[PDB]
Write a protein that binds this ligand. Structure first.
Ligand SMILES: *[C@@H]1O[C@H](CO)[C@@H](O)[C@H](O)[C@H]1NC(C)=O
Ligand SMILES: *[C@@H]1O[C@H](CO)[C@@H](O)[C@H](O)[C@H]1NC(C)=O
Ligand SMILES: *[C@@H]1O[C@H](CO)[C@@H](O)[C@H](O)[C@H]1NC(C)=O
Lengths: 188, 198, 151
């Protein structure tokens, strides 16, 4: 009998976590009277399951999921979760910046590892730029995914600068993520 | 019996759509006005019996065409409807962009900030409304009146090989090459260069 | 023809659509929904058609949606308070879509969309196009607007 039943989204994917062999199923909102089992988490011993890129899934509506504890001796009742509308509740992930330098220009390009069944989400990122241990950082304008942010560089000295970025997903309302791990390098 | 509103126009800049009009000559008393927009079903009311000479229509869909009408009302009698048609994507004015300018020796780094849409968000600006947005930059040496044009690929550009210790003024505007529609220019920002060429 | 602008819809418009889908779902649960021979979702994806044929399929789905929700706003005025702005937008997209257009999987699809209003209950069609509302806007319209980049 698993108690905590949580259907959460983290880094462009939907996971189901439960706390006490396990069986997990899902139900689509249009197919309300139909459940469907997960083949990957069939008899698993973990406490989380990937609810992303399922066989007959429909991320364009809300869906719930249920999980029950099983054993060679008994079966526990199903414990369904709350609904999660993907397009409105998905949490994005911080990008990975590809840093290149040309003359006095530093370009910070964002890259993403995205699930294959992901809808065509509108991703933009905000780059943070600052010297290592400054306190005051520099936020640049919101930039589309696929275009680099070009940054003016002072040629003198060789100061340790760090770079960070965060993703902004915008469908009905902007949804911000945390900032990535700051990538620090040797400016010149 | 009641005169209609005169000079009825739609002042729209960056999809801030303000229906402006001038109050006609009336001697019996203070007039009031009622503006309507044609929704999908019927003319819905926006401003009802206001004393102002304008009404906010920024909540309009901004896709497609809208029909707007306004009339003047005094006591129970009212004037005729003055009706206009407004297409936001085509009739709105593209405001000036922002421009951050930095001086670096004989170079000149300028970043362009998009014109903001108040009722939208930072991730949906005027640059995102039009599919063929491109900035348009114009600069000159202060006092020469000889303008030079440049079309940057994105929201950043560098003006290299300039004259040292010389003041240059720069402007930026939106532009749509599919229609050859130009936005308003930014206010001229003038900055002085330093020395030496790399 | 210039539908490339519809890759990114204005968020305020999507907030208006989201209020519509939330309002329709409240009315669909009390009506007689879920009829036999369902049409949405279509079993195949629009990328499996040629770029010039994708607007044709999208037009027939959008015209059905517009026809159903227009009949829904006239049935329930209270429900039409929210559907009004969505209806205006769907109509405009449909107008822009028809400007890009002159027995395979497209013939049978266009056929079932055409032979569904005459052989299905209203509450079913209402429920069928409601759950397909953001499939159409976020995926199908996006693909058609992306032209030769949707593949
Ligand atoms: C979920 O688990 C946490 C600890 O993991 C607990 O504090 C909380 O009460 C649980 N929620 C329930 C039982 O609803
Ligand atoms: C996000 O999930 C994808 C798989 O869906 C993975 O490739 C990527 O590394 C993850 N990013 C994180 C955990 O930051
Ligand atoms: C930056 O990364 C994106 C990843 O989506 C890629 O499409 C693009 O080619 C990269 N380079 C530039 C200059 O944007």
């Amino acid at each position: 009998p698993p108690q905590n039943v949580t259907l959460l989204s983290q880094n462009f994917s939907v996971y189901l976590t439960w706390l006490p062999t396990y069986f997990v199923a899902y139900q689509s909102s249009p197919t309300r009277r139909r459940w469907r089992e997960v083949e990957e988490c069939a008899g698993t011993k973990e406490l989380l399951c990937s609810m992303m890129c399922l066989k007959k899934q429909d991320l364009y509506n809300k869906f719930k999921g249920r999980v029950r504890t099983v054993s060679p001796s008994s079966k526990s009742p199903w414990v369904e979760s709350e609904y999660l509308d993907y397009l409105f509740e998905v949490e994005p992930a911080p990008p990975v910046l590809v840093l290149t330098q040309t003359e006095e220009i530093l370009s910070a390009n964002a890259t993403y590892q995205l699930p294959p069944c992901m809808p065509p989400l509108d991703l933009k990122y905000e780059v943070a730029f600052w010297k290592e241990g400054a306190g005051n950082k520099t936020l640049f304008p919101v930039t589309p995914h696929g275009q680099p942010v070009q940054i003016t560089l002072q040629p003198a000295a060789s100061e340790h600068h760090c770079l960070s970025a965060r993703t902004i997903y915008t469908f009905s309302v902007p949804k911000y993520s945390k900032f990535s791990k700051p990538t620090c390098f040797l400016l010149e | 019996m009641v005169p209609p509103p005169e000079n009825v126009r739609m002042n729209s800049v960056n999809f801030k759509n303000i229906l402006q009009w001038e109050s006609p000559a009336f001697a019996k008393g203070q007039l009031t006005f009622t503006a309507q927009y044609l929704s999908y079903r019927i003319f819905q009311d926006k401003c009802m019996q206001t004393t102002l000479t304008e009404c906010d229509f920024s909540s309009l869909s901004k896709y497609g065409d809208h029909t707007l009408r306004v009339r003047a009302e005094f006591a129970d009698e009212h004037s005729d409807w003055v009706q206009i048609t407004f297409c936001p994507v085509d009739d709105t004015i593209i405001g000036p962009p922002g421009m951050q300018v930095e001086v670096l020796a004989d170079s000149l780094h300028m970043r362009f900030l998009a014109p903001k849409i108040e009722n939208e968000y930072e991730t949906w600006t005027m640059k995102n409304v039009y599919n063929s947005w491109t900035y348009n930059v114009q600069y000159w040496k202060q006092g020469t009146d000889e303008k030079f044009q440049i079309t940057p690929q994105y929201d950043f550009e560098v003006l290299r090989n300039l004259e040292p210790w010389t003041t240059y003024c720069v402007q930026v505007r939106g532009f749509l090459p599919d229609r050859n529609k130009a936005g308003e220019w930014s206010e001229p920002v003038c900055e002085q260069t330093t020395h030496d060429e790399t | 023809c210039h539908i490339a602008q519809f890759k990114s819809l204005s968020p305020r418009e999507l907030q208006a659509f989201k209020r519509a889908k939330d309002a329709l779902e409240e009315s669909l649960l009390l009506k007689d929904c879920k009829c036999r021979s369902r049409l949405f979702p279509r079993t195949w994806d629009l990328r499996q058609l040629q770029v010039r044929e994708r607007p044709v399929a999208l037009e027939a789905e959008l015209a059905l949606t517009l026809k159903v929700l227009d009949a829904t706003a006239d049935t329930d005025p209270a429900l039409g308070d929210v559907l009004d702005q969505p209806l205006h937008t769907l109509h405009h997209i449909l107008s822009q879509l028809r400007a890009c257009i002159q027995r395979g999987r497209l013939h049978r699809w266009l056929h079932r969309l055409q032979e569904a209003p005459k052989k299905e209950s209203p509450g079913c069609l209402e429920a069928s196009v409601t759950f397909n509302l953001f499939r159409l806007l976020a995926r199908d319209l996006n693909c058609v607007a992306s032209g030769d980049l949707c593949e």
